[PDB]
Amino acid sequence: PAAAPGKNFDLSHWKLQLPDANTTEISSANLGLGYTSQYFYTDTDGAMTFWAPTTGGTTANSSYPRSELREMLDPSNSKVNWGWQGTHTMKLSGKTVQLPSSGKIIVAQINGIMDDGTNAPPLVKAVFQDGQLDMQVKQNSDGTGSDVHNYFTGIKLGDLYNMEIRVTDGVAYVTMNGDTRSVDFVGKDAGWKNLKYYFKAGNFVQDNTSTGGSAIAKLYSLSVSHSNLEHH
Ligand X SMILES: O=C(O)C1=CC(O)[C@H](O)[C@H](O[C@H]2[C@H](O)[C@H](O)[C@H](O[C@H]3[C@H](O)[C@H](O)[C@H](O[C@H]4[C@H](O)[C@H](O)[C@H](O)O[C@H]4C(=O)O)O[C@@H]3C(=O)O)O[C@H]2C(=O)O)O1
How far apart, in Å, are the Cα atoms of 211 and each of 54, 78, 208?
Answer: 8, 33, 9
Contact 151, 131 (CB under 8 A): no
Whichever of 109 and 150 has its CB closer to ligand X, that residue is: 109
By CB under 6 A, tell whether 206 contacts ligand X.
Answer: yes
212 binds ligand X (CB under 6 A): no
Distances (CA, A) of 18 to 35, 38, 176, 195, 198: 12, 10, 26, 25, 17
**Contacts with ligand X: how many residues (CB under 6 A)?**
18
Q: Is residue 109 at the binding interface for ligand X, with CB under 6 A as the rule?
A: yes
> Does residue 17 bind ligand X (CB under 6 A)?
yes
- CA pair distance 82, 13, nearest whole angstrom: 13
Gap between the Cα atoms of 73 and 75, Å rounded? 6
Among 62, 77, 153, 180, binds ligand X (CB under 6 A): 62
CB-based burial label for 89 (10 Å; 0-12, 13-18, 19+): middle
Part in contact with ligand X (CB under 6 A); list of ranges 28-36, 121-129, 153-161, 220-228: 121-129
DSSP code for 230: -
With residue 187 as reference, give the H or E element that holds it. Answer: helix 185-188
**Least distance in angstroms from the C-beta of 97 to ligand X:** 20
Q: Which of 111, 150, 175, 203 binds ligand X (CB under 6 A)?
A: 111
Contact at 8 Å (CB) between 209 and 101? Answer: yes
The reply to whether 121 sits near ligand X by the rule CB under 6 A is yes
Check residue 122 for interaction with ligand X (CB under 6 A).
yes
For the chain, give the number of residues.
232
Amino acid present at 137:
V
Q: Does 60 bind ligand X (CB under 6 A)?
A: yes
Q: Does 49 bind ligand X (CB under 6 A)?
A: no
The contacts of residue 118 (CB under 8 Å, 6+ apart) are none
Binding status of residue 225 toward ligand X by CB under 6 A:
no
With CB under 6 A as the contact rule, the residue among 22, 44, 61, 211 that binds ligand X is 61
Nearer to ligand X, 44 or 146 (CB): 146
DSSP 8-class letter at 2: P
Nearer to ligand X, 8 or 27 (CB): 27
Q: Which stretch binds ligand X (CB under 6 A): 54-62, 83-91, 151-159, 181-189?
A: 54-62
Q: 3-class DSSP state for residue 16?
A: strand
Q: How far is the CB of 31 from ligand X (least distance, A)?
A: 14
Question: Which chain residues interact with ligand X by CB under 6 A?
Answer: 17, 25, 59-62, 70, 78, 109, 111, 113, 119, 121-122, 125, 143, 204, 206
